[PDB]
Structure 1
Amino acid sequence: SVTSAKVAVNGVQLHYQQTGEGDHAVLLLPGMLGSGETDFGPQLKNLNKKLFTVVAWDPRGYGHSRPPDRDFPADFFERDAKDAVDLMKALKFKKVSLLGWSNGGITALIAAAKYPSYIHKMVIWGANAYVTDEDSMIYEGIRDVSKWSERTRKPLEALYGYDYFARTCEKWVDGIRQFKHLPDGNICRHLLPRVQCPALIVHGEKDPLVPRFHADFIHKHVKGSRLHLMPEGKHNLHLRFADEFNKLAEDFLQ
């Protein structure tokens, strides 16, 4: 049983979903253009409701956190990280663990580094702490939503409507693209050494959007982190292998 609602945080009404009664609060952070509704169906239903209290948020401009419309300033990842922790604080949790997928994992790495006393543990997958030419190219091939597989496009076209969907996707490529021009193509390489909580980095060896070197780099610099490779996993491994991923995360969080 899942409840959806909005809460006022930093000038925006953020939408989120909540389920469970457990004393271990967990925030599910979605990837680009994501939402609790489209990115975390299997988690919101299957994660142990006895052990955890699960919340899936919609970053401003994504999901149902509209208005406002999504924009991508130089600090958009840090802004999402602030909103994410302020949202959990708004919901009265005193500490939380984080499950971050893709851009959501980047956000989670940032939150843990900036608000270490608030974060217990974290599980991230498909994140990249910087942008390279290989990434830049990958993102260019993702730009046009029309070129997306009817399956991957259906839920998002339904959520936002084509126009907003395709357009936001464009601004995202332009937004994630801006980092290549900073020293080291940096997004958060400098914050990895500041992550102080136990971290589990999962990576699908067949992930087509994020090269494995990004998972190896984050494992290397996040002290005490563990890196788990899934031979058949792709970028959406928590959906394609929900039961397998869920056990991995639940075993790690306890």
Structure 2
Amino acid sequence: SVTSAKVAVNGVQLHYQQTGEGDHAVLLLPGMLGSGETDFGPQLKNLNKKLFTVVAWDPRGYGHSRPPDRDFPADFFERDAKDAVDLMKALKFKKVSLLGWADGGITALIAAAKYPSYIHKMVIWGANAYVTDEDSMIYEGIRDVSKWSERTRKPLEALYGYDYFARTCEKWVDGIRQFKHLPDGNICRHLLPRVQCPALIVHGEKDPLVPRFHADFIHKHVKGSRLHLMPEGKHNLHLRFADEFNKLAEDFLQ
């Protein structure tokens, strides 16, 4: 049983889905153009409702957190990180664990580093702490949504309508590529050493969007972190291999 609602946070009405009665609060952070509805169905359904209280939020401009429309200023990951934590605080949780996917994992890393007393544990996958030429090329190949597979386009087209979906994807590409021009193509390399909570980095070895060196790098600089490789996992491993992933996550969080 899942409840959808909005809460006022930093000038925006953020949408989120909540389920479970557990004492361990968990926030699910979606990736680019994502939402709880499109990125975390299996988790909102199967994560242990007795152990956890699960919340899946929609970053401003994504999912149902519209208005406003999405924009990508240089600090957009930090803005999302603040919104995410403020949302959970608005919902009265005293401490929470984070499950972040891709852009959501980058967001989770930032939140753990900036608000260490609020984060218990963290599980991230498909995230990159910086942008390289190889990444830039990958992003460019994603820009045109019309060339996306029909299966991956359907859900987002239905949620946003073609126009917003196409336009926001282009702004995302320009928004994430902007980091390549900064020293070290940095997004959050500098915050990794500041993560103080136990972290589990999962990586699908067949992920075509995020080279494994990004997971190795995050693992290297996040003290006490654990890295788990899934031979058959791709970028959407928590969806394609939901049962396997959920077990990995639940075991780590306990």
- TM-score by structure 1 length? 1.00
TM-fit CA distance, 1:20: 0.1
Partner Cα distance (1:225, 1:160) in 2: 36
Alpha-carbon shift at residue 253 of structure 1 (Å): 0.1
Q: How far apart, in 1, do the equivalents of 2:64 and 2:195 lie?
A: 30
Give the whole-Å Cα distance in 1 for the aligned partners of 2:211 and 2:140.
15
In the TM superposition, residue 11 of structure 1 has moved relative to its aligned partner by 0.2
Instruction: Tell me, in whole angstroms, the C-alpha distance in 1 between the residues paired with 2:76 and 2:246.
Output: 28
Deviations 1:218-239 (A, max 9, x none): 0000000000000000000000
- Distance in 2 (alpha carbons) for counterparts of 1:90 and 1:103: 22
Q: CA deviation at 1:53?
A: 0.1
1:26 CA drift (Å): 0.0
Cα shift readout 1:127-180 (whole Å, capped 9, x = no counterpart): 000000000000000000001000000000000000000000000000000000
Structure 1 residue 90: Cα displacement: 0.2
Counting matched residue pairs gives 254
Shift of 1:39: 0.1
Alpha-carbon deviations, 1:61-109, whole Å to 9, x = none? 0000000000000000000000000000000000000000000000000
Equivalent residue, structure 1, for 2:122: 122
Structure 1 residue 194, shift from structure 2 partner: 0.1
Percentage identity across paired residues of the two chains: 99
Q: Report the equivalent of 2:227.
A: 227
Deviations 1:196-228 (A, max 9, x none): 000000000000000000000000000000000
Shift of 1:35: 0.1
Residues 17-46 of structure 1: per-residue CA shift (max 9 Å, x gap) = 000000000000000000000000000000
3-state SS of paired residue (2:190):
coil
Over 6 Å off, 4+ runs: none
Counterparts in 2 of 1:29-108, with a 5 A limit? 29-108=29-108
Specify the SS of the correspondent of 2:200. Answer: strand
CA distance in 2, matches of 1:41, 1:83: 22
- What TM-score comes out, normalization by structure 2 length? 1.00
Q: Which residue of 1 aligns with 2:140?
A: 140
SS of the residue aligned with 1:190? helix
SS in 2 for 1:175: helix
**Cα RMSD after superposing both structures:** 0.2
Query: Per the alignment, in what secondary structure is the counterpart of residue 191 of structure 1?
Result: helix
Structure 2: distance between partners of 1:50 and 1:186: 39
Structure 2 residues without counterparts, runs of 5 or longer: none
